[PDB]
Design a protein around this ligand. Sequence first.
Ligand SMILES: Nc1ncnc2c1ncn2[C@@H]1O[C@H](COP(=O)(O)OP(=O)(O)O)[C@@H](O)[C@H]1O
Ligand code: ICS
Ligand code: CLF
Ligand code: SF4
Ligand code: FES
Ligand SMILES: [Fe+3]
Ligand SMILES: [Mg+2]
Lengths: 522, 274, 121, 477
Amino acid sequence: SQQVDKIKASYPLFLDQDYKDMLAKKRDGFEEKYPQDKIDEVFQWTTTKEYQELNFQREALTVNPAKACQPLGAVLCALGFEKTMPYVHGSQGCVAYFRSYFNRHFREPVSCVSDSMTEDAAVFGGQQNMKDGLQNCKATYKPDMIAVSTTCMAEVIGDDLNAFINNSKKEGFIPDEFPVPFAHTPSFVGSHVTGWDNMFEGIARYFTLKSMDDKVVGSNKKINIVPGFETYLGNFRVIKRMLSEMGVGYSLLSDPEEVLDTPADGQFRMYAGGTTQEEMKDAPNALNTVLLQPWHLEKTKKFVEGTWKHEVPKLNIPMGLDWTDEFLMKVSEISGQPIPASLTKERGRLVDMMTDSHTWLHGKRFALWGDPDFVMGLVKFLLELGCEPVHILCHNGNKRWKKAVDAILAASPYGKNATVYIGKDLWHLRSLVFTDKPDFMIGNSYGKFIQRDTLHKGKEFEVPLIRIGFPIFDRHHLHRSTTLGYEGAMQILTTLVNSILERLDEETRGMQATDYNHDLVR
Amino acid sequence: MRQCAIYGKGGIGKSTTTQNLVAALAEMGKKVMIVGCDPKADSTRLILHSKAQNTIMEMAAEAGTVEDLELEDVLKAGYGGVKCVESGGPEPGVGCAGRGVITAINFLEEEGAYEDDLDFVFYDVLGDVVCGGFAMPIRENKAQEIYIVCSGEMMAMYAANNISKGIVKYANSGSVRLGGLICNSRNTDREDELIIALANKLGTQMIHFVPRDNVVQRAEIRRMTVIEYDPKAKQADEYRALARKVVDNKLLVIPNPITMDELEELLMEFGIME
Amino acid sequence: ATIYFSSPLMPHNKKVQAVAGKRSTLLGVAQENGVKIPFECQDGNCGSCLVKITHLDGERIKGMLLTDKERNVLKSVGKLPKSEEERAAVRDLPPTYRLACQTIVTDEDLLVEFTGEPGGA
Amino acid sequence: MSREEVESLIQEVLEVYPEKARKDRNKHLAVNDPAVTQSKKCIISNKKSQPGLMTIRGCAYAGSKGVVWGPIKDMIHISHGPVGCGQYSRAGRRNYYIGTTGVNAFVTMNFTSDFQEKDIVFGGDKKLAKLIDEVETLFPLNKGISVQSECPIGLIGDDIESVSKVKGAELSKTIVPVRCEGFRGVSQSLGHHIANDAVRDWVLGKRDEDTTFASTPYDVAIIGDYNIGGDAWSSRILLEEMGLRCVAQWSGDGSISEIELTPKVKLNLVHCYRSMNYISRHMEEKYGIPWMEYNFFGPTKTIESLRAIAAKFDESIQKKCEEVIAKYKPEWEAVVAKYRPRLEGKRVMLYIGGLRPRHVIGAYEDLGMEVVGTGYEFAHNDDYDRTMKEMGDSTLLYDDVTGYEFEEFVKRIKPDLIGSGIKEKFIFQKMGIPFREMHSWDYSGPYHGFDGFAIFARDMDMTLNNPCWKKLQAPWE
Ligand SMILES: Nc1ncnc2c1ncn2[C@@H]1O[C@H](COP(=O)(O)OP(=O)(O)O)[C@@H](O)[C@H]1O
Ligand code: ICS
Ligand code: CLF
Ligand code: SF4
Ligand code: FES
Ligand SMILES: [Fe+3]
Ligand SMILES: [Mg+2]
């Protein structure tokens, strides 16, 4: 039954009495559902601490992973180039899933192609698939360069990329002068950030390996910026603005903001902006090269140090106050350009914000997860805010990263009750937040279910989720936010303090029960 | 629309006599089809004037598969009346050597190259061993009439006997019948009445006895048929006569296979072998 | 998966258990088990490994993809009737004839016959 | 209209492709002729996608785990292999259900084997066994386990059948090993077939002895309804109001007990013929269970299917069906009266996976829209024979359409509404053309029955007649 005036969505149409009766009949008749008290008992058992001990004894089962395979990062890195297409030498399912994932996250068109092999190539290799895919892509979508990544199956079959590409260019399939950089991206090693790093290193090696005779460091008076795996266009914007406000010649490399954000004006642009090929060819002439995310840019670090002869600074990712200041120090000392007064005013605005919101930010307990450098930046910023990070998880973090985060936690008196986990998944976070309740979690959309679980135990045990990281699916246009720099710290502080105040307002809204604290001014 | 096939030992002038028969058939207002199943693609050399016709399977493999093959790319009409197609063969030791005939003929019916303008279709099949693709035109009843090329050499007779056994085995499947025997002549004594006697004991008729002549080698250097080279040559008139008896041949019989010993007895009684 | 290899060349049909879904095809399981099926190419075009496949357990029939190369080679030998082609194209059902180097092992019991001759008599 | 314009359009679109791609793609575009019964002479389907053409098809793992096995709630599904495959398929499909997550239901959770380099080098059989044991210890309530193989499992040659049998014997639990490697098959159709075969060869055979269930001359099993946004619940309440008893639901809100009890059902109602025709055929052959296709999209199709459904039982079911029709008539009459004038005359093109292009033409036509173009990613020839009649003359039909192609046809045709997936929603939304997600109902629904028909009409009026579509061009341009 549906009233024409009040058309009703599935919620709450399925809350009608007749639908409830039919669902009850089905469950009692044919689902053979276990008794409800048994379900509640098992839920309470999963809440308990011995279940946490059993959960931490896991070595073969991963429940709710917080990472993606390398070709996703490879595609994200490849999309950062001008008139460029990502070509994943593998099965079409991989490309379909990457495109669906990025369409869900960024809510913008994403272009990616594959050779879509089958049993034929599984038994006899996919050299022919390479040839047809390359020539078809060139004839159809007219790119200026095709960046080739690989899936798991192409790596397992031992498919090499250089030989097949050379044979395709030799047999007249594609022009011999067409830039076609490649990289090996196995899905069983590392995570998406490692794939981004591999793709970037492959492109840099294709473009700047056979022409190192005439390259002189510092010739063009320019700095190279490598952003790494980034899903925040605002980070690119703040980097560009901060460097432009400082009067420094900068070369952002693999930057996809222009293609990941295009104006709707009646026509669809498959290609939009990007780093030109000359910029990569002119990269070794730069004075230096800084990496925005060092802990997932190690292979490209080795390449840039051993080939471009650039003294890469030991810089941490520009989140918070201290590390942004260090980044500005390094940029100033490399370029020789003094810090403008506008940056000082913005930093002072940050200090004013932290002073204003310290009365609420202090003493709060946070469980956070995400990519390693994002996680470490958030931990540092929380430590500068008087917060108390209780549960730190990085699914794709190594032992050295754990040692570094341990060192940074030992440097502040607010890291006393902090524990760092690597190789853990979101089920371990659910167990941790159930046994040792934090005040909030900081993570992507996948944690929203954990909150739900807490809400079953009770309102006093429910812990809310603030969405920072990747991927964010249940909120719209939050990918536009800024995280790095003073502006990013500004936005993070605003979001955190507003979530805290919203939680307090929701708790103190009971009428004649808890509304005595429902203050107008906070 | 009659379909015929040259069966016989290699090197007995199958391709050359066949092609001269085609040249003779072209001029009296007849449109004819030529395809050669010989692994060497020399069955269409003289008509097409090409150095070597690109066979069906070579450019099918280069183009990926036979689906991506165009009829016009293999259906070349060197002369106006006649078109020329080559079946081809695999590399030695790579599968059965007759599947090229399978693919060629299947593609030919698939694209319908047998439509509304055919008077004769003529195939040149290697008759040394009848098996797989070589035995195929006997089997699916594609070639109604079969003609055997032979000489005075004993292996030619043995090959003709194997052809007779093959057609006898598949007589009930269709209208595959032996239309006669044609025998080229080497410079050896007591030849024509020999093949006449083989036909007599075979239950079949002797079509024509084509001799060895000098004009053939000159045509080979020329890469045009004798009738196209020298229409006044006596060999050209011989080929024309052969063609007109092929067109005017009426009897098509079920052959009788002949044992080894009786063949040997004929061979000793003629003295071709001791 | 159980495989039963039968041939006039073999005095006795050989039974042996195989792992379903291995990247190595029935060609591999033929080589490791001392059964000789003529093999004459590494690109799957010769067709000399043509074999008769029978699924004894009719209920346990597994869908599979008949690739274009196997389809065209089966046309080249001629062991592909029109009805079998249409059935494989629509219902994704295996044909009676297969190529040993292009057939994947499925989790069931199978009987494979050959004459020891290359595909095409 | 303008059929000549259509084939000239497809000629002018196909020129950019090379000779191989052009020749192959020319077989996959056609102009509909309703008089054609065998589509094999007009359209070619179920073929491999041309490499490097931005295809939309998925993998067999998507067709099996993300489509068939996933909706089942009381079983735990293990993505055997690397991490990306399950992660990109985690809760991306709105197969609704009732239950508690992590305790008795595990639909929206990701179980993966977490393969690494040593797992590829040495094997994953022992790791799979340890994982099964750990699943049993961490999750006692679950009724069963399925193991969905991914590309590396098939490529490295692990024996998941043997470990499944051994662990099932040891723990007295149903373990279903399914081989849905992404390279297997050209699209999700082989994933559907593999999932169906695994269901047939494990669950159906798991119990044949039981007869303890009390049957009724009115047992009907829903087949191929995945409760996308609640579709299966609306279909089920419509069925139960008619006087039947729904025993099994495959697989949205589907339970393993219903799957096992399904062979004790008098009549099978197949919703998605493509995804679940194999099991229907196997059931009809073995248990002698009659099955038939029904459509619940739009009032006309719903009424026709309901009448045909009641035609297979006694007169009481027919009387109840007439009562239900009379009861629900005014609701959809009012919906039509409200929304048809705003919706009359608009032209729409569609592109959905399988049987959805043909199922929803009735709903579009009831509201005054007409379909000018349609097609499928992975439908076979039988679906095309079924759908040629339902489309008007001189309309567009396409299979495995590419991004460039689809963009050119939409540019030339210029429709008013387009229904397709997420991967095209934003490439078409920037061209100023309204677009509806036809897979997930755009986080809305359901669309089945009259209750879902109301949602369908509301959403379509909402999307098509929106002010935002009038402001794509700047006033100073
Ligand atoms: N009437 C003839 N006079 C002279 N030589 C001939 C005659 N017919 C055939 N030959 C010779 O027989 C040889 C066989 O040629 P061809 O037919 O191409 O090979 P095959 O007999 O194996 O098909 C040729 O080199 C040709 O010179
Ligand atoms: S199962 Fe199939 S792609 Fe038949 S894989 Fe896909 S819930 Fe589509 S056109 Mo998503 S063959 Fe169902 C489908 Fe249709 S997931 Fe749903 S909408 S009716
Ligand atoms: S076609 Fe299908 S979905 Fe694709 S991989 Fe293959 S089974 Fe899977 Fe998952 S893990 Fe990542 S995304 Fe692939 S590259 Fe290796
Ligand atoms: S049938 Fe004849 S052509 Fe074929 S492989 Fe055997 S001997 Fe060779
Ligand atoms: S070995 Fe040649 S086709 Fe199998
Ligand atoms: Fe957008
Ligand atoms: Mg010759």
